[PDB]
Structure 1
């Protein structure tokens, strides 16, 4: 018995086991485009994924993760509001049961069908485990997905989902290029936040891209065929694995554009 997205263990219940859920810098948040402040000090994002090495895709019960080799600076994120080098460790998605919901962050209260999270950790802290204990330990790149035309670079992920339908299943997933998931523009908003799943640590510097990337209804449909449960257990479709927007409180959202 643990946390999930059901009516008995959903986000509204998380605070009982993880008190930080009611913290001062929780994520996600609603991005108000008119209150967001343009900051000329912000440098362009530097995404170096040319040497990225994917290893495995895994169903972790609350979503599926596509893991990368982070033993060296193969795939890194620099620039933007960041100071230092952050290594890509995984990426995953959150999606809904309907096309009108699924994203965690919202833009002027607008919800997207899904949201992609590329997680990177600050190399100065050695390893992911130590990084999550620091205020500038992680740097998550968030990308919105809207339903429209299909995304060629996502199909490879879509095709292997059948092999990791239930919790605990994993499959080799090599030579996947994450560059195929990026929109044309790298304009972004940024704010200090947390991990949107337990244990909800406030160690994150969020970089949410303004431009969404389109996926077809067929591609999103296959996401909805995954199961929260493990094999041999009652089937529960993996849908609506998103946390609602949290209070912004004493925080300012900055934009790299105007």
Structure 2
């Protein structure tokens, strides 16, 4: 049992191969908006994506991901709760079988239809493998998706998903601008946590934006046509690829806004 999201290999099984699943700083979590403290010392987040170079889009058996050139400081996250500079490696999504679930973080127990993660790693550690071994190695920018109006900036992604239906498939995905996926406000919540997929490493500063983006029903329906399986294996829709909320334990969620 390679891990997944089903009855026999899903999140409640992960601790057997990855014991840190039951650790002290696991993600995602419920963001209780009334308990999160406004921290007037938190800086605005700096998102510098003007020089981003997308490379490929890939179905990895658990999500689909757009990968970027992280060999230079072209698309970087700085400021906010972070020290130093974090390079964009990839983005991917988590989504549901229906619109009432799909997000990993929840807000006062509310689930969104999907959640976008933009994954960045701290350049002081030189590469992402080294960064995942450090408590401040990664910064993941989390954006909620609700269903309503279409997101134009998402359409270029949606339109190539038919070409990466099954696990292992990839395609050229150049000149994609991730600025088109961002909401107006960069107000955020932040807390120390983990990767939400194996190996569940406790290396992430989470930055979760308050404002969701709206996507259309037709856009999310295309997510739901992807397959967890490889080509030629029984077809199993890539849906509900989200880890549930984990215990907060001894952590404080801080808000950038009043």
Task: State the TM-score, normalized to the length of structure 1.
Answer: 1.00
Spell out, residue by residue over 1:60-91, the C-alpha distance to the aligned partner (whole angstroms, 9 max, x if none): 00001100000000000000000000000000
SS at match of 1:20: helix
Report how far residue 141 of structure 1 moved. Answer: 0.1
Spell out, residue by residue over 1:113-146, the C-alpha distance to the aligned partner (whole angstroms, 9 max, x if none): 0000000000000000100000000000000000
SS at match of 1:12: helix
1:228 equivalent in structure 2: 228
Flag as ranges the 4+ runs of structure 1 deviating above 3 A.
none
Report how far residue 7 of structure 1 moved. Answer: 0.4
User: Structure 1: any 5+ residue segments left out of the alignment?
Assistant: none
SS at match of 1:13: helix
SS at match of 1:129: helix
SS at match of 2:42: coil
Whole-Å separation in 2 of the counterparts to 1:91 and 1:133? 20
SS at match of 2:139: coil
Whole-Å separation in 1 of the counterparts to 2:100 and 2:198? 25
Task: State the TM-score, normalized to the length of structure 2.
Answer: 1.00
Whole-Å separation in 2 of the counterparts to 1:198 and 1:77? 24
After superposition, residues 151-230 of structure 1 pair within 5 angstroms as 151-230=151-230
Spell out, residue by residue over 1:129-171, the C-alpha distance to the aligned partner (whole angstroms, 9 max, x if none): 1000000000000000000000000000000000000000000
User: Structure 2: any 5+ residue segments left out of the alignment?
Assistant: none
2:257 equivalent in structure 1: 257
Report how far residue 239 of structure 1 moved. Answer: 0.0
Whole-Å separation in 2 of the counterparts to 1:159 and 1:138? 29
Whole-Å separation in 1 of the counterparts to 2:28 and 2:76? 23
Whole-Å separation in 1 of the counterparts to 2:67 and 2:243? 22
Count of residue correspondences: 258
SS at match of 1:120: strand
SS at match of 1:231: coil
Whole-Å separation in 1 of the counterparts to 2:22 and 2:9? 16
Spell out, residue by residue over 1:24-51, the C-alpha distance to the aligned partner (whole angstroms, 9 max, x if none): 0000000000000000100000000000
Whole-Å separation in 2 of the counterparts to 1:65 and 1:152? 18
Report how far residue 98 of structure 1 moved. Answer: 0.4
Report how far residue 241 of structure 1 moved. Answer: 0.1
